[PDB]
């Protein structure tokens, strides 16, 4: 969509991922793995909760009856009330329809953004030592065991430490 990741260059979601909203999935000599990203998932959830906290919990103002439900009244003043009340209903239904439409547009685009941010984070972390597949993956030009994969997942991966050889295998 806006940020080109969700329903963009990442072709689809993972239904197996239930620990979080965004996450990682790897393959190296020791096999395959899956793991969720805490920071990005929490970033997205908190902003949805923010939205929910604003639409729930508002304090309403007091209103009294200006009609009678039972001793239906007089006609001229009634028509003025019906008019005014329908005119207001149009206003609130429209606003509601707009509010939700635009909040939704924003939620969807926000979620796309947090996915892109997670991509960009990792791309910069791998420095010269990987290449982008174009599908949401990075191909790592050095041998990256399960601890190395974890380093990438908690932003502790040291570029210096594998640069020598990454470059060497990129030189081909």
């Amino acid at each position: 969509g806006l940020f080109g990741a969700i329903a963009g260059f990442i072709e689809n979601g993972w239904e197996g991922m239930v620990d979080g909203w965004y996450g990682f999935r790897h393959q190296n000599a020791q096999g395959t793995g899956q793991a969720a990203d805490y920071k990005s998932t929490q970033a997205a959830i908190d902003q949805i909760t923010g939205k929910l906290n604003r639409l729930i919990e508002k304090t309403n103002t007091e209103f009294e009856s200006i009609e009678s439900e039972f001793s239906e009244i007089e006609h001229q003043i009634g028509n003025i009330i019906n008019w005014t009340k329908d005119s207001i209903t149009d206003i609130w239904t429209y606003q509601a329809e707009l509010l939700v439409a635009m909040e939704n547009q924003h939620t969807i685009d926000m979620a796309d953004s947090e996915m892109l941010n997670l991509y960009e984070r990792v791309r910069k972390q791998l420095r010269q030592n990987a290449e982008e597949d174009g599908k949401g993956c990075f191909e790592i030009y050095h041998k990256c065991d399960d601890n190395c994969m974890e380093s990438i997942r908690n932003n502790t991966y040291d570029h210096t430490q594998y640069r020598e050889e990454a470059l060497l295998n990129r030189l081909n």
Binding site: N12, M17, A29, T59, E64, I108
Partner: protein, 319 residues
């Protein structure tokens, strides 16, 4: 090379919502913003309510039999029902609606005596089978049907004035009897021209009882026209009359503020609520509701949508 891949979650269990661009977007989850459920009861927990049952608010001020339990009181909430009784002897009040509203917005009523005395030749305790109590004929509790003490006798020219010595305005109601026959007029009052004038500093009017036949209600073919004003603190209101006045014995003081509810729903003392309508009570944290534009209290705003889903997840792209 070894591979690390980035991805997001999805569900098979997808939900459809609306955006600026698209009327059908699958998202992973979503939540309703329009309330559609109401409780079929009136949630009165922790309110001083008054359920009028068969009593109509106006009957509280004139003292109809149906309203005997409700002639005085304090409340923060008043409940009216649909075929409540206002009148025993048939009649109508001028600006009935305004009067009905002032009471429903009042939070309590006290009755103050007028102290009007009449003296002999007047029988001030007229009764009718239209206003029964126990046993026998009665009349509105807050008014007196004044009548010549002797059947054919002319009714005396009389004058009564009520003085508001409180520091709050008082509501006075009175009636004017429109009898059904020249015979009935002659028997209750004179054979003389009848005339009633009422005057305060802020109010002034004259009335003439009018003889004539009208459908029996049901009961009687005569009628009473009720009229009312507010008497300001310190003001006097005088009645000049020679037959036909239905005089006030007590006036009313309306006390503060209260929520007036019109509903047929039955009361429940173990839920609480700040929003009510004819169909009962609405209790929700959602900003909008589906149930009625006509609601009272602190209510979500009425909308014309069955449903409005707010996305609480990302765009859903399954495998």
């Amino acid at each position: 090379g070894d591979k690390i891949c980035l991805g997001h979650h999805a569900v098979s269990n997808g939900t459809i919502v609306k955006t600026l661009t698209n009327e059908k977007e699958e998202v992973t989850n979503a939540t309703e913003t329009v309330e559609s459920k109401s409780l079929d009861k009136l949630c009165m927990k922790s309110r001083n309510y008054k359920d009028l049952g068969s009593c109509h608010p106006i009957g509280m001020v004139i003292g109809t039999p149906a309203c005997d339990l409700h002639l005085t009181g304090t409340w923060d909430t008043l409940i009216e029902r649909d075929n409540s009784i206002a009148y025993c002897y048939p009649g109508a009040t001028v600006n009935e609606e305004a009067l009905r509203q002032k009471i429903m917005e009042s939070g309590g009523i006290d009755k103050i005596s007028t102290g009007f005395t009449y003296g002999s030749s007047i029988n001030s305790a007229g009764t009718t089978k239209a206003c029964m109590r126990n046993g026998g004929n009665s009349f509105y509790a807050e008014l007196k049907w004044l009548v010549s003490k002797s059947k054919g006798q002319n009714f005396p020219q009389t004058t009564n004035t009520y003085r508001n010595t409180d520091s709050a305005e008082h509501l006075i109601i009175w009636g004017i009897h429109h009898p059904s026959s020249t015979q009935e007029k002659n028997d209750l009052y004179g054979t003389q021209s009848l005339s009633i004038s009422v005057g305060s500093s802020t109010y002034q009017n004259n009335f003439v009882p009018v003889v004539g036949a009208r459908p029996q209600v049901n009961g009687q073919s005569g009628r009473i026209d009720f009229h009312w004003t507010m008497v300001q603190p310190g003001d006097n209101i005088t009645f000049s009359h020679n037959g036909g006045l239905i005089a006030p014995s007590r006036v009313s003081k309306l006390k503060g503020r209260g929520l007036g509810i019109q509903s047929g729903a039955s009361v429940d003392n173990d839920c609480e609520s700040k929003c009510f309508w004819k169909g009962g009570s609405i209790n929700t944290k959602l900003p909008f509701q589906n149930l009625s534009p006509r609601t009272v209290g602190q209510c979500p705003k009425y909308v014309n949508k069955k449903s409005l889903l707010l996305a609480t997840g990302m765009r859903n792209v399954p495998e």
